[PDB]
Amino acid sequence: TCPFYKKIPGTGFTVDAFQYGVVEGCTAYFLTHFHSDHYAGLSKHFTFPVYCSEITGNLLKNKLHVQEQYIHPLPLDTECIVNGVKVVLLDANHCPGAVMILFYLPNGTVILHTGDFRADPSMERSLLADQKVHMLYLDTTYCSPEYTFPSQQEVIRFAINTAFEAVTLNPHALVVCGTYSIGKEKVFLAIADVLGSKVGMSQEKYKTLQCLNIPEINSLITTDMCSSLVHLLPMMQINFKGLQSHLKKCGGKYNQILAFRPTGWTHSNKFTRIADVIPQTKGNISIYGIPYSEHSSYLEMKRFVQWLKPQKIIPTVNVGTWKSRSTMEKYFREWKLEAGY
Numbered sequence: 001t002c003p004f005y006k007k008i009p010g011t012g013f014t015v016d017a018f019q020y021g022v023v024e025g026c027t028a029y030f031l032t033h034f035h036s037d038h039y040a041g042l043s044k045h046f047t048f049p050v051y052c053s054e055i056t057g058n059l060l061k062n063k064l065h066v067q068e069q070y071i072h073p074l075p076l077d078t079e080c081i082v083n084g085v086k087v088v089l090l091d092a093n094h095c096p097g098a099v100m101i102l103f104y105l106p107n108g109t110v111i112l113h114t115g116d117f118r119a120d121p122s123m124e125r126s127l128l129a130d131q132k133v134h135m136l137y138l139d140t141t142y143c144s145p146e147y148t149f150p151s152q153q154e155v156i157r158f159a160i161n162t163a164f165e166a167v168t169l170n171p172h173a174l175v176v177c178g179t180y181s182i183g184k185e186k187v188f189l190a191i192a193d194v195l196g197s198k199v200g201m202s203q204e205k206y207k208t209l210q211c212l213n214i215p216e217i218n219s220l221i222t223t224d225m226c227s228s229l230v231h232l233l234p235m236m237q238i239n240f241k242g243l244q245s246h247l248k249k250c251g252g253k254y255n256q257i258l259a260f261r262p263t264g265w266t267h268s269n270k271f272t273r274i275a276d277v278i279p280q281t282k283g284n285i286s287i288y289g290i291p292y293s294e295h296s297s298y299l300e301m302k303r304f305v306q307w308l309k310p311q312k313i314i315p316t317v318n319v320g321t322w323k324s325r326s327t328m329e330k331y332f333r334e335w336k337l338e339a340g341y
């Protein structure tokens with residue numbers, strides 16, 4: 001049964017609710033982004049209207065084979081009417097195709113559903129500037145002050161400089177980057193650009209990337225692993241055994257691996273600056289964990305909410321424990337008392 005924080009009151013709508021069967025009263029199913037915890041249940045046999053971005057709709061049609069007649073892509077930053085209700089899709093600064101959804105209820109209430117997002121001050125000049133929001137369904141993944149991490153730009157600067165130094169010292173080094181979902185494509189694209197290489201990958205991953213509307217993508221990626229010195233591998237293979245095995249397969253072309261695991265936050269974030277990050281090394285294999293986040297830090301979250309001034313907050317992450325729920329509610333009240341709404 002579909003939980004309450006996935007339902008939009010006063011409409012026939014649900015958000016990211018495909019794993020509950022036929023939801024009673026739902027006339028339109030919205031999908032914020034193509035991550036498995038959110039699309040769980042979709043397939044070629046789904047026969048209700050799905051509303052989403054263009055990019056998410058390319059992924060539904062090519063990767064899950066959802067039939068075309070049930071895919072309803074909407075343009076961003078544009079007022080659309082869906083089953084008699086005005087909606088707007090906004091860029092969520094999460095993975096490719098990820099959106100936040102503004103719903104203008106027939107009674108005058110305005111609801112923002114963030115989906116998954118990384119809050120940014122540029123959102124303060126979107127269509128959100130123009131009216132009041134009563135209810136916020138909030139991505140609270142990192143809603144605690146211990147969750148600090150650097151900007152995406154500092155993280156990519158670290159990765160480019162690290163990879164360029166290593167391969168210029170040793171032209172026979174291979175760079176490997178882990179992946180298990182869409183998102184974080186700047187990590188492997190930025191490194192391949194500094195090295196003058198395409199990114200090599202499996203046919204299944206190439207297929208996925210081809211759905212993303214990235215400009216000039218045919219110039220940046222390939223399935224011919226032999227021509228490339230940046231390879232993508234499943235995240236599970238980014239360990240010493242997995243990487244040793246991969247280096248065997250490359251036929252003596254390479255004699256060293258430098259690998260990257262883009263994680264979210266890890267508790268090495270409470271002590272170390274990005275500048276000071278060091279790898280784990282065994283022999284001719286080095287593995288860097290880099291804190292590339294596609295979710296808000298605590299401070300980015302707090303700034304957004306204090307700017308938006310919602311009347312009510314509904315968390316969508318960390319909702320399963322009483323300790324989590326109580327912690328999040330305390331911070332919401334602090335924020336509201338400090339800013340005065």
Ligand code: NI
Pocket residue numbers: 033035094116
């Ligand atoms: Ni996500």
